[PDB]
């Protein structure tokens, strides 16, 4: 089963102007759900405007979601950002109180 | 021991108007500490205003904290949000430099 | 190898006025990359302004990065904040599509 039967958090920091394309890519890969945070950052003094996108996934392989975001967020210039995958141990839907991988 | 002797991050995305009730519920369950982030999101094009609540816990079972948030954040309409539990490997209190589960 | 050959997320919640000193400390320890989020919180009703700093690390020990942040963020008064270390399972550089610990 995808994600070894578990749940993963895909966290991407990307350019603000690529958010629209990332949203479209996520919808197209079948994992439209996302939470966006406005952030500031630097990679390798003054911080630049960035966007954090978070997608918790279970049914869709986390590497597939990461690839979709990366392809949509890419420009080829320094500052394009990074995607990280973190383990999630449980999930609860607030509306129903449903828990586990099927809660999403 | 609670949380199998470890530390967990409870991350909830909820409606902004439910934050006050969630804060009260967290205080009542004995885990008042929280960090709030203003975010935007969609579940299953335009993003809606949401709130992210993060609570790192050790002494209080993470599922108890999650249940408290879910009950307070519930309305029964689509958009109520989700709660995720993630593993935390260590914690440090900045004021004292105390580390581990007792750092909170 | 550092971080047991893996990748870690160091997440710190600190006073806003300490961000400049934390940035300098991170550069000095050799891990300048960071993402900053403006947040609100309380520790142990009204929430106070705080800053969340996130640093994903592989080459630099996560406890070294945490110590650098803690020392720079310290004042000795309640409200100084906390640092948490979370596991990260994978990373992707958007610009190159490079993956794994060497993606950072
Ligand atoms: N290791 C990291 N930890 C936390 N945030 C990072 C990390 N690497 C990159 N970021 C975030 O992604 C943004 C762009 O990073 P990146 O494209 O690596 O910058 P650069 O090309 O200048 O090294 C940064 O401004 C920061 O917000
Ligand atoms: N799998 C997920 N990953 C990231 N964020 C999510 C996920 N599911 C829900 N969210 C967040 O919670 C909010 C409300 O979600 P939800 O109640 O599931 O919406 P819906 O009922 O329309 O499917 C979303 O707008 C988003 O911010
Ligand atoms: N267990 C926790 N979970 C989530 N956020 C926390 C936690 N502990 C502290 N914080 C964050 O760090 C900030 C400062 O915390 P802290 O210095 O512990 O406050 P206090 O000294 O009043 O207990 C809080 O306002 C909150 O944003």
Question: What is the architecture of the domain spanning B1-104?
Answer: 2-Layer Sandwich (3.30)
Say if ligand 3 is within 6 A of residue C81 CB: yes
User: Count of CB atoms within 10 A of residue A76's CB?
Assistant: 8
CA–CA separation, C47 and C41 (whole Å): 5
CA–CA separation, A67 and B29 (whole Å): 40
Q: Technique behind this structure?
A: X-ray
CA–CA separation, A96 and B50 (whole Å): 18
C75 and A73 Cβ atoms separated by less than 8 Å: no
C59 and C100 Cβ atoms separated by less than 8 Å: no
Extract the tokens encoding A17: 């102007």
CA–CA separation, B16 and B12 (whole Å): 11
Dihedral of alpha carbons B11, B61, C44, C70, sign: negative
Q: Strand pairing partners for A86?
A: A9
C34 and C104 Cβ atoms separated by less than 8 Å: no
- Tokens 């197209």 correspond to A28
Residues 6+ apart with CB under 8 A from B46: none
- Tokens 């929430």 correspond to C47
Q: Using only C-alpha atoms, what is the Rg of chain C?
A: 14
- Cβ C45–B33 below 8 Å, yes or no? no
Judged on CB neighbours under 10 Å (0-12, 13-18, 19+), B2 is middle
Extract the tokens encoding A22: 């990332």
A94 and B74 Cβ atoms separated by less than 8 Å: yes
Gap from CA of B99 to ligand 2 centroid (Å): 34
A42 and A48 Cβ atoms separated by less than 8 Å: yes
Say if ligand 3 is within 6 A of residue B34 CB: yes
CA–CA separation, A54 and B42 (whole Å): 11
Judged on CB neighbours under 10 Å (0-12, 13-18, 19+), A56 is buried
User: Count of CB atoms within 10 A of residue C15's CB?
Assistant: 20
Q: Give the 3-state DSSP-derived string for chain A, with helices as H, strands as E and coil as C.
A: CHHHHCEEEEEEEECHHHHHHHHHHHHHHCCCCEEEEEEEEECCCCCEEEEEEEEEECCCCHHHHHHHHHHHHCCCCCCCCEEEEEEECEEEECCCCCECHHHC
Q: Using only C-alpha atoms, what is the Rg of chain A?
A: 14
* Residues belonging to chain C with any Cβ–Cβ distance to chain A shorter than 8 Å: 7, 9, 23, 32-37, 56, 86-95, 97, 103-104
Phi, psi (rounded to 5 degrees) for C92: -130, 130
Closest CA to A29 of A52, A10, A7: A10
A71 and A25 Cβ atoms separated by less than 8 Å: yes
User: Count of CB atoms within 10 A of residue A17's CB?
Assistant: 11
Subunits next to C (3 or more Cβ pairs <8 Å) are A, B
Residues 6+ apart with CB under 8 A from B1: none
A33 and B39 Cβ atoms separated by less than 8 Å: no
Resolution expressed in Å: 1.5
User: Count of CB atoms within 10 A of residue C76's CB?
Assistant: 8
- Chain A neighbors of B65, CB-CB under 8 A: none
In degrees, to the nearest 5, what angle opens at C-alpha B9 toward C-alphas B99 and B94?
A: 30
Residues 6+ apart with CB under 8 A from A46: none
* Residues belonging to chain A with any Cβ–Cβ distance to chain B shorter than 8 Å: 7, 9, 23, 32-37, 56, 86-95, 97, 103-104
Judged on CB neighbours under 10 Å (0-12, 13-18, 19+), B17 is exposed
CA of B93 vs chain C CAs: smallest distance (Å):
5
Say if ligand 3 is within 6 A of residue B37 CB: no
The SS3 call for residue B26 is: helix
Phi, psi (rounded to 5 degrees) for B6: -110, -160
Domain boundaries, chain C: 1-104
Judged on CB neighbours under 10 Å (0-12, 13-18, 19+), A1 is exposed
Say if ligand 2 is within 6 A of residue B48 CB: yes
């Amino acid at each position: 089963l995808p994600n070894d039967g578990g749940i993963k958090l895909v966290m991407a920091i990307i350019r603000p102007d690529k958010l629209a394309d990332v949203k479209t890519a996520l919808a197209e890969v079948g994992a439209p759900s996302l939470t966006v945070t406005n952030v500031s950052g630097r990679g390798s003094v003054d911080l630049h405007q960035k966007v954090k996108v978070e997608c918790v996934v279970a049914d869709t392989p986390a590497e597939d979601v990461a690839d979709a975001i990366a392809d949509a967020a890419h420009t080829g210039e320094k500052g394009d950002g990074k995607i990280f995958i973190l383990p999630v141990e449980n999930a609860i839907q607030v509306r129903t109180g449903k828990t586990g991988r099927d809660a999403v």
